[PDB]
Amino acid sequence: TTIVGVKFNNGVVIAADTRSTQGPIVADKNCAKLHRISPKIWCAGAGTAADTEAVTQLIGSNIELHSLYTSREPRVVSALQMLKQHLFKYQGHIGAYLIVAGVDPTGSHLFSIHAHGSTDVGYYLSLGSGSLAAMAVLESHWKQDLTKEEAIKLASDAIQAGIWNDLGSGSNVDVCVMEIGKDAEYLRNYLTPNVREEKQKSYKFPRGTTAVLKESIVNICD
Amino acid sequence: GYDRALSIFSPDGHIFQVEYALEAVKRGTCAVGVKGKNCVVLGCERRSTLKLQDTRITPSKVSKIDSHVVLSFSGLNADSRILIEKARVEAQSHRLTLEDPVTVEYLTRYVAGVQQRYTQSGGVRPFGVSTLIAGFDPRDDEPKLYQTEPSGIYSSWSAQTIGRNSKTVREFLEKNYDRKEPPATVEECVKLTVRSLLEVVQTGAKNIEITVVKPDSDIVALSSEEINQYVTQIEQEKQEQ
Amino acid sequence: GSRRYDSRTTIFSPEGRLYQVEYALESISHAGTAIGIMASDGIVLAAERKVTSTLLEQDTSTEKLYKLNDKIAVAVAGLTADAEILINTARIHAQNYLKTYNEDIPVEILVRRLSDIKQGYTQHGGLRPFGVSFIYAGYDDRYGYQLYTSNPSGNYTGWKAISVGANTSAAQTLLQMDYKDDMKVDDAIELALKTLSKTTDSSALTYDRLEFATIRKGANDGEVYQKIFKPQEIKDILVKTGIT
């Protein structure tokens, strides 16, 4: 898994692969690890995918509630708070890792957290297996004052580095751009270099190839 | 959380809640039971204010707590159910705990406290039900007849009735029953029962419902026909003079 | 001191009565007339939508006839809110019972379940009871169709047919008059509708003024089938009564 995010000039964008695994085995060739906490606050996660999704759903719910309850727009920090506040309570036994970012009235924000409540902040962040590959891409080509496309382009490739050079990272490219001024845009499968070639053969079966002991029709309604 | 003490000594030292529960008992349709020499029979008037009911699915005013032990009562059908309940648990408990079903008394004394508790219990009212308890002890055929009341007091009776008019039929029973001669035959015991019954029931068979505990978890409720046959016979002997 | 404020719900009348229970029953008199019948082949459920209007939306609206289970649905006489509580609980209770035994609850068990729950407020808590009573319509393995009832006191009985709400005695009379044991559902349907139209306190008995349902083992079956009729269907069968 490789999840990344980069604060750019007017905001921050995040990216992660669509690859999901069970150990050596790809769990989902195309999945979405990016998730909306609030329309302008989005997060993707590493470690337990169930956890990442689970907690995320929970927090944004509160966030939304809190947002409604405040009737003001969410603030990345409050989420950021709750997470560690939530997580740290679990002593990290919830193993989720989060690159969380968002644009809000206070502004654009980019944050990384780990299962135990450790929360970090920086213009560029990458987590997961191939994060190092990304982090390299980050450390090399990150500069201050990135554009959208700079943010797009840079984040684009860091993912690829993981995609290419990390086994846990691959499949397709998910992109959620969060810009201060505008609505966020979630780009699903934003890049899909990994398209499988056509199967060298069609393995479709002639009917009757299978021995059916018995057949019956399952009723649905009452 | 609601502790409020409903049951309290009157200026003259009474608990009217108890005393009023006695009224719902009286208000409760009369219930009666008598113990034959080997046996016990439980008469009950079906609340006749309504009809067209399905009596099959409608529970019997008498109910079994345990295979060898049954209970009948007079009072709010509600209050009974809870009482009915815990006793059922109790026997099973005693069964489980003591490797043995209860003595009729044992559960009886048990149930009594439950009422008796709710008396000096706070935040609850007492039950409005007085009960009659029937059963034959484990490895004992002997008739065991017990009368309890919301005050949580129990006792053994050669015969007993409860509910509305119970005094009336009691007077009947007091003379009609003889300790020196229990109506040994279930039927005659049933007979004496139904005799006592029409004394209140005011002419009904269905209005009447009967149950008999015999030894060793032998317990039977009687059909109106069986009832009516006695009703018929009883009437005759009366008519005869 | 708090004592000033306690209505002292559960305390006995000097006659050993519970006026709240009494009064709950009394509000139930005010409740919309609801009727049910155990036919030979099924059980009929019809109740008057009470306090109706033009812009009142009928279709989604059910204020009376609710389904606890596919073998147990109920008609409600009382506060709509209060029942829904018990409604939900019983469902769970049944579901639990189901989830316990993988088998449907014999109706009385569920009935007696709610029975004592009502009785819960009766004997303790200083808590007002529910102003609700119920028509319990259920099919079981054991007795097949079972038509039960309950009162806020929790006391409850079985029935070949029964009515609740207003005009009960009137209905009961009409019912205890016109009913016969072998009645088929469709007879009982109209019979109720007959009783309904007559026991209707308003001018006309109309679908939009009614909730209606049936428990029936269908012709193609082995699944005893509950059905609530749609307003039109009600309106349709409303015509079939000749009531039109």
Add this chain to the structure above:
Amino acid sequence: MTDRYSFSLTTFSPSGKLGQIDYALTAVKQGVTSLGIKATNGVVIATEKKSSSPLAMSETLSKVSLLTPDIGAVYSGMGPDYRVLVDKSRKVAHTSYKRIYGEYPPTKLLVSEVAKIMQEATQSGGVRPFGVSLLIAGHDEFNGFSLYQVDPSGSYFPWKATAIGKGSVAAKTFLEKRWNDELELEDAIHIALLTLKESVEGEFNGDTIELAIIGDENPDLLGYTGIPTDKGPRFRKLTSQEINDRLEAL
């Protein structure tokens, strides 16, 4: 301390009545007349924004509030009661539904859920029923648009359209006059304007009046893009402009 009022505060009258509820209804009837209308294309609700002083900033008070992107609510009665119920309603929706089902409950259940609360107030000790009733409109996938009315009785039922508060009788009267099935929201919107105008005594305008609809999903309001499945909230609140715009359209 240690609340010793555990006993139900409202008790059945000798007549079998619950006076607090009745008095709640009384207070509810006292409530600012507020309406709702379920049209073909959607549902609209409306109420007069009550200013007890121009120094006070009306917008800072919202009598209409979104519960879910497809559900929002309004009342007639004591503002504060309405206030807290909103949060619970909001919360229970997330918790008891979304945090279970990951979405926003069908209008009925949430309504059914909300009313559940109000009942509890009636029953449990130490508490009184709330000083409001609720006109609740929502669209769900399967039941589409729907409009509900919840009392301090915790009773709730659907409407084709309705109004609560004082003039509601007169409103509902005119509503029944005006309402048809095939009303589209805008006319219904216009209708509500007409209707509430009657219930309106002092100034009648978007700054005096509170309007919102259950409309079609609003991707703009979704706050983000890129998700096909979610096209945004169906609910929206209407601007005094839009209001006064259609108050020209009067």
Add this chain to the structure above:
Amino acid sequence: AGYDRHITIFSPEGRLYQVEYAFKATNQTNINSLAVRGKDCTVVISQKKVPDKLLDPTTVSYIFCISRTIGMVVNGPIPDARNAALRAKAEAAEFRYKYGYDMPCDVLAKRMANLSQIYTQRAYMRPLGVILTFVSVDEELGPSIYKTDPAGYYVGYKATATGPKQQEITTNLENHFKKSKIDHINEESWEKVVEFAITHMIDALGTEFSKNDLEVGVATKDKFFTLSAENIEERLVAIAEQD
């Protein structure tokens, strides 16, 4: 029966008199106070009354600083004031703690209003007979004014006052604000805004005030604070000039 008076339950008219009586204890302390959003700022002016020498006047305040940003002035029994302020103070930090940023003013009020709403509905809880006034410069809203009652009811205000003569001060500003047509004072310096209010305070009270006479507090960006008697007098100086 008539206990409905004594407890919180709908009157036969659906009314809560304990609440309405709590509305009495509000002006019971008999302090006419006011709040106005300045241009960038918000100022609260209030009567500081010292009955006794033996008192410590400095210890006498109904204007309480809830947060770094949020001050609050209270109208009603000082204990409830001393009570309520802490409750608020608890919230913000916890809000700040939970939510990472200081509670915007309304939220507090919204939050606090709930409590009354709770007390409103709860019986054994009595409500507090204080009216609360929440202002600060909200980073999003700049100047903001919020006033809550024992009913759990509250609203924003272009400006507001509280006290026995609150009614008149209300009129005065309404007139002034209708005259101005603008919600907040145009004056950038709260200093003027203070003097402005005190003017209209003196005005609508027809009553002159010394440095001790007034309780004063100043909502500024990111900070609320209260003036000294000097600052007061300082304002009292210039008002004596313009007027």
Add this chain to the structure above:
Amino acid sequence: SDPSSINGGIVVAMTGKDCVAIACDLRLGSQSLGVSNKFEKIFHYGHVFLGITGLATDVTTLNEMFRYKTNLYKLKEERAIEPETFTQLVSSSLYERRFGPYFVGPVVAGINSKSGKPFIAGFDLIGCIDEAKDFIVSGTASDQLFGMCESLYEPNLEPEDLFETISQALLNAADRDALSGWGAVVYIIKKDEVVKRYLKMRQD
């Protein structure tokens, strides 16, 4: 001592053309011991069906829990559940167990009734949501399954082709697991109807 491995057995779903095919073996066993060739790992709620692999008693237990919940849902709903809703429900239920977790591979598939759309989903034991548009696999032989499916599968098969496809997919994979065997059942599922079938196989 993998509670998943103790029962063994496996479950697969697929997305056919306008249809979906769910399958599991019928074998149950404790370790090398096989027990019930008659055991069934798939279940159905309204039009929404659930196969599950894992510790069986859990599957058994959970099976109720949803059936338990579904009704409560459906009754309140006055309508059957759609899978995607039910999807959340499962994950919620699972992650609710996050540190109490069942040992289960659950796989949810149906055809969305409103959209008329076929649907599949699959989970970890704590409720991580794996949704694919092709096939979902669960059970010890999952490794075999991908080998079959990811090779065999192609988009939008017709149910019987789909059936025939998922069949050999399952059948062959079954033999390549010890714990999966003893017959196989398939629900061929269409917007209207669902066809159940049994499949001859190696009974070793």
Add this chain to the structure above:
Amino acid sequence: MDIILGIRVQDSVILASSKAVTRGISVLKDSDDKTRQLSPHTLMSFAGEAGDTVQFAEYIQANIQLYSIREDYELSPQAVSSFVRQELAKSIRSRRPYQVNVLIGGYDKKKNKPELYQIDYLGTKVELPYGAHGYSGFYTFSLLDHHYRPDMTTEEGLDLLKLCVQELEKRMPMDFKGVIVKIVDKDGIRQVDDFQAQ
């Protein structure tokens, strides 16, 4: 471990239980009953954790009767099996889980059919023609897979049982000190006394 054996023949269920009792080195009771009667038509046999397998058993037994007398009704083994599993399902996740492995034999009256359920301490339930626990079936099922026919009469399986027993008698290391043979049918439960010689 002990030996819990059961078979659902055509019209009846036969339940067999090793009669031995062992604590460590000693065989304490060779006459032991390892089963408990849930109802007239419901018998339950069990092996497992010493205290538990007793405690749980009787515990459940009271429960059903309690419910039974409550409803004045004898439940389907199906529900009973259903019920029992639920207990295990909890207990296995309880603080100190039962270790118990049960056969519930039962004759459904409503179906007029015998019913034979196996549930592990894990609480995994299945109804079978025949079943066992632990090492028991490991020898037997072959013979059962070999011989068994559903129609097979009450007497027939007993023979098949004895053979299977003999297998265990032969192939199992630990002496089980004979077995009890009981039968659930339309008449409910009765013990066949004579089996080791049969």
Add this chain to the structure above:
Amino acid sequence: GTGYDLSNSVFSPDGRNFQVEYAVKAVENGTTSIGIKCNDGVVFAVEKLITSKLLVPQKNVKIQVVDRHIGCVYSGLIPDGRHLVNRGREEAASFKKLYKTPIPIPAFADRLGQYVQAHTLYNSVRPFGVSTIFGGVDKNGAHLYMLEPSGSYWGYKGAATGKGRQSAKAELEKLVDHHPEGLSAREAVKQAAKIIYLAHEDNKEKDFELEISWCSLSETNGLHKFVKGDLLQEAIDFAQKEIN
């Protein structure tokens, strides 16, 4: 209606709690006692009413100390304030336990006022029948506080409670005018003694004893301590002269 007083938390029709107001009754009835914040610090003065010779001198002690820097004294029902005092002793302990510092007087002041007011918040909670004059030297100077059952306390240049408070409040007002400078603790000691005797003139009907304690940033360093022996006897005769 009426009887609003009859339950604590109830608002009077004018929005008041007469119980507290009634609690205030015995407060006045409480033994007249005063407190003074001198220049650096505070002084606590209380009359000890001698009921009988069987009373053992000096033994039953009114003024109570919280932590080591905070003295407290109250007119009212002794066990009340005592009960309260302990809670304060608790409060500071917790406070210091948390904050490692002895508690600021105002801090300490606040905490109680809540706890008192708490007893205004429930019809089942009996308000306090005492009003404590209390204070001491803290991080910033001293402070002089007297808390009412109302939950109201204030900073006090001088403070008095109980019967003779008027005679006191007189004298306190005077010394304020006599010494707007401040006052030396010694004179603070001395003057109070006079004040007490003067205050005693209301209760003059019986003999009493004089207890005075003090907290001096100088003399007690900021500790709170009694006035004793000669210095105690000094202010006595100092007053016992000046009283004539």
